[PDB]
Ligand binder design. Structure first.
Ligand SMILES: N[C@H](C(=O)O)[C@@H](O)CNCC(=O)O
Ligand SMILES: N[C@H](C(=O)O)[C@@H](O)CNCC(=O)O
Ligand SMILES: [Fe+3]
Ligand SMILES: [Fe+3]
Ligand SMILES: [Fe+3]
Ligand SMILES: [Fe+3]
Ligand SMILES: [Fe+3]
Ligand SMILES: [Fe+3]
Ligand SMILES: [Fe+3]
Lengths: 167, 167, 167, 167
């Protein structure tokens, strides 16, 4: 299936406030898809950004295993507590307003927790001819981005997701 | 009808060439969706751009009936001649690379002729759950943009369309 | 070693309040060592007490795997989140005032988190000739109760521990 | 000295027998630590129990100098005779099964003669980190209960000692 839902019963309003407060202390980097690493490699010197990556030469997600300690008593830490799997290279992934991806396939699927979104933010699966929206409802959505797809955000606000790798 | 094609026997490469020449002496305006009016109101004093103004300034597309004189002797001239309907408020509409717009409805459907495009440029119809690609094949694609839709260009070049209105 | 410490940085005061409030809704059973099960077997009909056990005929801990759902947004749930292992048959184990055990050996060691205690509550290792006190400091203490031992509580208040099995 | 033994050639079984007979006509009082005074103050009107009163009522153990008359012709009589010191405030002190008392200090050290006991009955010295067992072997065990200590009986029977004070 392109998408599947895992109920976490996270409170989206408390989740949002927690993410917003974290970003004031650790701001997103890049443009287009702005990022913040939530997991770092052991003894990381740059724990908040090393995991962030855009370039075409993809790296391996295996070493990005440690959830930042300062998440431990935030509501955002509670999201990690309820996951049904061991996440890797978890990142905040925020699509800029009026921004979209090339039509392409990723090497690995990922789980998405939408923190902030709108009706203007969608995944477009080209061969499946399916348009998909991830609601900020506190639940976890597996999205098979190995399928030929793009994503776009036609809104004026950033579309903020938390994106988890697995294994 | 949601979309339809009218074979119309236009040479994509001549078109692209005439479009590119026209724009060197009449540049697109705006960011995101860049525009140029190909028709004006009778007696307009800004005929190349009045028709590009935002909707809140334009009562009716029907007022822009006059194809610029200096198109008479160009390949665009015969484009206008081949049309099976009468055109109004025709514009060049270019989507910037990595750009998309909100999910919305237009007042009237539109006829699209793609000048330059790529596999990363699509229309999305939200309630119909259809993804559409308009190829630069010299034919005329009707798009019922009254339906809830967005368009996006995930490529690195602008996606240049000529967009015709009608009754 | 008889004992070893794992820092959880749990706040003992918040831990205590949380345990006290839970016990008003789900009271301890038995006398001497009063108990409450914090993990139940899948689809348990008696989730709060089935795991509690005293009789000489010990049972296996393997099926008691599910932390009660209503712990999920208590501070007590945070204790389970920070554990460095998968606990089984976790119980609140409260020694009554003026109460002590026979001198004996258990089949398996356990981890102890002291919630409420005093200087009057000790483990006595008979062959090691060691007297040991588990402080209510928010950390986790492995105690090798396979060693010949007793425990006693000479205070006037209950000595409340959370006791985790492992694997 | 923390503990010492004085061989004293007393028959454990006769002792147990004389103790058990004495108690059928002079029962222990209290719960937890059950007691009977073997010595009284000269002219006491409650000679079997005045010496069992709590500390806040007893100025000095030295006042209870008189071994009850009716012990003269019993095996307990010769017990008193074998003593290498002069006894005062001698009592039978029995720990209830599964009972212990607080960790504390007594005013004066004491001489213990175990009548009935088990491997589940011990003294614990907290700062010295020693566990002591007093066997019912007919010998006299000095215990410096001025040291921070508790005692406990993890068995199913009472632990009966005879406890002698001295100067
Ligand atoms: N990791 C990127 C993303 O999910 O945002 C990648 O898969 C796609 N980048 C597409 C582009 O360069 O338009
Ligand atoms: N599970 C019991 C406990 O840890 O409390 C057991 O190991 C000992 N029971 C001793 C007794 O019956 O005194
Ligand atoms: Fe991608
Ligand atoms: Fe479809
Ligand atoms: Fe539109
Ligand atoms: Fe948590
Ligand atoms: Fe035990
Ligand atoms: Fe020792
Ligand atoms: Fe004492």
């Amino acid at each position: 299936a392109l998408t599947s839902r895992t109920e976490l019963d996270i409170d989206p309003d408390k989740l949002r406030e927690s993410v917003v407060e974290l970003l004031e202390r650790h701001p997103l980097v890049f443009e287009g898809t702005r990022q913040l690493a939530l997991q770092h490699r052991p003894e990381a010197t740059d724990p908040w950004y090393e995991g962030c990556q855009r370039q075409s030469l993809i790296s391996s997600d295996s070493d990005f295993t440690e959830v930042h300690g300062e998440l431990r008593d935030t509501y955002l830490g509670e999201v990690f507590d309820r996951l049904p799997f061991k996440p890797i290279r978890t990142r905040i992934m925020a699509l800029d307003p009026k921004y979209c991806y090339s039509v392409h396939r990723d090497l690995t699927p990922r789980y998405h927790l939408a923190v902030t979104t709108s009706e203007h933010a969608r995944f477009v699966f080209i061969e499946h001819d399916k348009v998909l929206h991830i609601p900020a409802d506190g639940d976890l959505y597996y999205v098979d981005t190995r399928q030929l797809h793009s994503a776009f955000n036609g809104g004026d606000d950033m579309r903020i997701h938390i994106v988890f790798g697995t294994d």
